[PDB]
Amino acid sequence: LLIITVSGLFIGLVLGLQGYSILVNVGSESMLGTMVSLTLLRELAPVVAALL
Amino acid sequence: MNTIAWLGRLVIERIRGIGVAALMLLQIIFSLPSAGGFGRFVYQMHRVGVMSLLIITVSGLFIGLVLGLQGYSILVNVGSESMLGTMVSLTLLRELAPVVAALLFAGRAGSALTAEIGSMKQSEQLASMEMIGVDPLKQIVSPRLWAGIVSLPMLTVIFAAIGIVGGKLVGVDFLGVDEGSFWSGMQNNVQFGHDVVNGIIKSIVFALLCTWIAVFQGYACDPTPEGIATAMTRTVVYSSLCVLGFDFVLTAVMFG
Amino acid sequence: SRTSELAVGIFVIIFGIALFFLAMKVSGLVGTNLSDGYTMKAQFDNVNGLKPRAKVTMSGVTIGRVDSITLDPVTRLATVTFDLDGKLTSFNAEQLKEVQKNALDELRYSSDYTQATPAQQKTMEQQLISNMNSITSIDEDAYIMVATNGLLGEKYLKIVPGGGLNYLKRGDTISNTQGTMDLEDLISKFI
Amino acid sequence: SRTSELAVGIFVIIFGIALFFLAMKVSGLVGTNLSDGYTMKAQFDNVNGLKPRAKVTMSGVTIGRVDSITLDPVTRLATVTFDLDGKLTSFNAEQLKEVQKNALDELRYSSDYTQATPAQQKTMEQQLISNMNSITSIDEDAYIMVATNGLLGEKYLKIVPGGGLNYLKRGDTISNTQGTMDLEDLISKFI
């Protein structure tokens, strides 16, 4: 249990850090909450949870 | 009441245990290895690196196939399919190829440095070596540690190379993206001396803390084959806490 | 020393339980839900894209949230029930009389005190307790309209003050209102 | 034994909270559902880029969703099936009688009184019971069209009210529809 919290805390801190700074240039800082959710939920939380 | 002082003071033999591993670490590198060291050093590369090679290609091929698959479909709606090549490169190179390369390496070879030394502790393989007279800190530690340092930046470049070339295969062969805007999206935004070089300097200190723990926690462990697995997690736990704990200082010193 | 070491480690780890709840505040399920607020409401005819817990701004600085949205089906009116702040939206003790005598400079003015009963003082007396509580920083004439933030996705509420002499109460209804428009206003006037 | 009864019982504590986080603070099924919600349908021409479970609005309030989008080759069209709300779209009994005799005020509307029947109760008493039959706030000749939440976003149904004095029933079909408009059409809008 003590492991996956820290690597859980990490990847969200990164994925919402870098895509926004390119995305803010057009019109979208409100779709920040979507891209963090829909890539963790349907893509990484199955995969990267097992490899730890 | 005695549990909270049993859970108390548990840091102290751990911080005294960590203070031992520092005192071990100087004693390995501050001596000149003899003849016959390079021959085992090659075999450790044959053991650690060459065996680790078949894994990181497949997980290298995977993550590029995913990251260029899903962000584009939201990004195509405004004006940008040409910045697909930038977002795949600059998140693999400065963010994931340091981090996710180690967690597969701490998985395979972060264990097989412990259990190979948890081998020689249970059958007194270690103790017989001292008794005949060698020093395993010169014999079975130093060619293991020097392969662990070298072979990880030798892989994480290999990882991200198929990592980018993987995402090309979904783009131009299935999503029909323009090839020229793909690469020249990268060549304008990805400098060499600030990204790929500083993706290596992350991967060296991600290789040292991952492999030095995995040597020490297999050496100073009690030979009980139950606790050989509790010592096994403390390789992985203390690696993954520190390979993630020292991304956040390394991201801040490079940029921001 | 045994005792020393023990106690030390104890408090040390304990902290981790202490900072846990300060880390639990940022989860949004406990802690930091607005203090010392109150409630107003208004009436619209178009609330396009407005969701609950959107922002309310005075001139570019946020002052509350929007909590309850309804439509009145009998004459097709929208009605928002939102909560402001009570620290950045109200006068304190000194600022009351410092503007109540500026209100009485408007209340007992040459244009108003001369036209009403100019031999009384009750209208100057009744205005002080009535403006003591149930009072805002929003003028009695001030319009609220749905602006468009994010310039592509949003609609935080904008409260524009100005003019007037008196203010509005702590629970009343802002009557000067302006519902939002859409891209179909942006095309129809353009065509 | 005693630690094991603790250290996995505390594990099912945390997993229940992190499921509660996803259900009741993230995803749509956090209660999104109105009372006796009935369904209607309508036909369109352009339903371009419209997913099921979209929003429906009347004045920007979320009154319902879109259920199914079918085509019919019998007449080359697209017929949208959607469920509205039953409370925000149907008048209450008090609001019913408020408009029912006002529909009798509309019926007996001067000439409207001696035009169908002033000598019979078919134009007088039947419209009273026709006022009650599963009534809607949607009038007899309102028009529905596909808007977009901003000029870069999703697609959702808004319904333009106004006009007419009679209403429609549950399960009817709204007339006067017009579909979505895009970049391939705005050229046709100007020239």
Q: At what angle do helices B49-75 and B37-47 cross, to 10 degrees?
A: 40
Contact by Cβ (8 Å): B51, B154: no
CA distance C135 to D151: 40
Report helix, strand or coil for B30.
coil
Q: What are D159's two structure tokens?
A: 């319904």
**Residue B242's closest CA among B99, B28, B49?**
B99
Helices in chain B by DSSP H: which ranges?
A: 3-6, 10-29, 37-47, 49-75, 84-91, 97-112, 115-122, 125-132, 136, 142-151, 153-170, 179-189, 197-219, 227-245, 247-254
Q: What are C12's two structure tokens?
A: 């040390």
Whether residue B4 and residue C10 make contact (CB cut-off 8 A), yes or no, is: yes
CA distance C163 to D40: 49
Contact by Cβ (8 Å): B157, B56: no
CA distance C160 to C143: 6
Structure-solving method: cryo-EM
Q: At what angle do helices B153-170 and B84-91 cross, to 10 degrees?
A: 160
Whether residue A43 and residue B70 make contact (CB cut-off 8 A), yes or no, is: yes
Contact by Cβ (8 Å): D80, D66: yes
> Angle B204-B208-B211 (CA atoms, 0-180°, nearest 5)?
130
**Strand partners of residue D78:** D44, D71
**Residue D26's closest CA among C64, C54, A41, B74?**
A41
Whether residue C10 and residue B10 make contact (CB cut-off 8 A), yes or no, is: no
Whether residue B11 and residue C12 make contact (CB cut-off 8 A), yes or no, is: yes
CA distance C21 to C27: 10
Q: What are D148's two structure tokens?
A: 């977009």
D57 DSSP 8-state letter:
E
**Residue C161's closest CA among C142, C140, C137, C135?**
C142
Contact by Cβ (8 Å): D80, D73: no
CA distance C168 to C177: 14
**Residue A15's closest CA among B197, B254, B66?**
B66
What are the residues whose beta carbons fall under 8 Å from the beta carbon of D57, sequence distance 6 or more? C48, D63, D156, D157, D158, D159
How buried is C102 (Cβ within 10 angstroms: 0-12 exposed, 13-18 middle, 19+ buried)?
exposed
Of all residues in chain C, the one with the smallest CA distance to A29 is C150
**Strand partners of residue D41:** D81, D173
For C57-68, the DSSP string reads: ESSSSEEEEEEE
- Cβ atoms within 10 A of the Cβ of C105, count? 11
Of all residues in chain A, the one with the smallest CA distance to B66 is A43
**Minimum-distance CB partner of A52 among B70, B95, B240:** B240
CA max distance for chain A: 40
Contact by Cβ (8 Å): C78, C70: yes
- A27 chain-D contacts, CB cut-off 8 A: 152
CA distance B14 to B225: 20
How buried is C11 (Cβ within 10 angstroms: 0-12 exposed, 13-18 middle, 19+ buried)?
exposed
For C68-136, the DSSP string reads: EEEEETTTTEEEEEEE--SSSSS--HHHHHHHHHHHHHHHT-TTTTTTS-TT--HHHHHHHHHTTSS--
CA distance B22 to B212: 10
Give Cα D122 to chain centroid, integer Å. 31
C-alpha count within 13 angstroms, C-beta hemisphere, residue B254: 18
Ramachandran sector of residue D95 (left: φ over 0; alpha: ψ -120 to 50; beta: rest): alpha
CA distance B60 to B161: 8
**Residue A49's closest CA among D18, D9, B166, B248?**
D18
CA distance B82 to C60: 36
Residue recorded with tokens 């723990």: B213
CA distance B90 to B84: 10
- Cβ atoms within 10 A of the Cβ of B34, count? 9
D92 DSSP 8-state letter:
-
Whether residue A30 and residue C153 make contact (CB cut-off 8 A), yes or no, is: yes
> Residues 4..33 of B with a Cβ closer than 8 Å to C: which?
4-5, 7-12
> Angle B31-B208-B238 (CA atoms, 0-180°, nearest 5)?
125
Give Cα D68 to chain centroid, integer Å. 14
A37 interfacial to chain D (CB closer than 8 Å): yes
**Minimum-distance CB partner of A7 among B78, B80, B244:** B244
CA distance C144 to B34: 83
CA distance C10 to B156: 41
**Distance in Å, alpha carbon of C121 to nearest chain A alpha carbon:** 56
Whether residue C151 and residue A30 make contact (CB cut-off 8 A), yes or no, is: no
For B101-118, the DSSP string reads: HHHHHHHHHHHHTTHHHH
Sign (positive or negative) of CA dihedral D107, D108, D114, D119: positive
Contact by Cβ (8 Å): C173, C72: no
Whether residue D152 and residue A37 make contact (CB cut-off 8 A), yes or no, is: no
- Cβ atoms within 10 A of the Cβ of D139, count? 15
CA distance B189 to B179: 16
What are the residues whose beta carbons fall under 8 Å from the beta carbon of D64, sequence distance 6 or more? D34, D37, D55, D56, D82, D83, D84, D85
CA distance D81 to D40: 6
Of all residues in chain A, the one with the smallest CA distance to C153 is A30
Contact by Cβ (8 Å): D164, D140: yes
Own/partner long-range contacts of C81-85 (Cβ < 8 Å, ≥24 apart): C81/C39, C81/C41, C82/C39, C82/C40, C82/C41, C82/C56, C82/C157, C83/C34, C83/C37, C83/C38, C83/C39, C84/C37, C84/C38, C84/C39, C84/C40, C84/C56, C84/C136, C85/C34, C85/C36, C85/C37
**Residue C67's closest CA among C86, C45, C41?**
C41
Contact by Cβ (8 Å): D34, D85: yes
Instruction: Put the strands of the sheet holding D177-178 in their side by side order.
Output: D39-44, D77-83, D62-72, D56-57, D155-160, D143-148, D177-178
Of all residues in chain D, the one with the smallest CA distance to A27 is D152
> Residues 9..38 of D with a Cβ closer than 8 Å to C: which?
21, 25
Contact by Cβ (8 Å): B175, B125: no
Contact by Cβ (8 Å): B86, B190: yes
**Minimum-distance CB partner of D26 among A1, A27, A37:** A37
C40 interfacial to chain D (CB closer than 8 Å): no
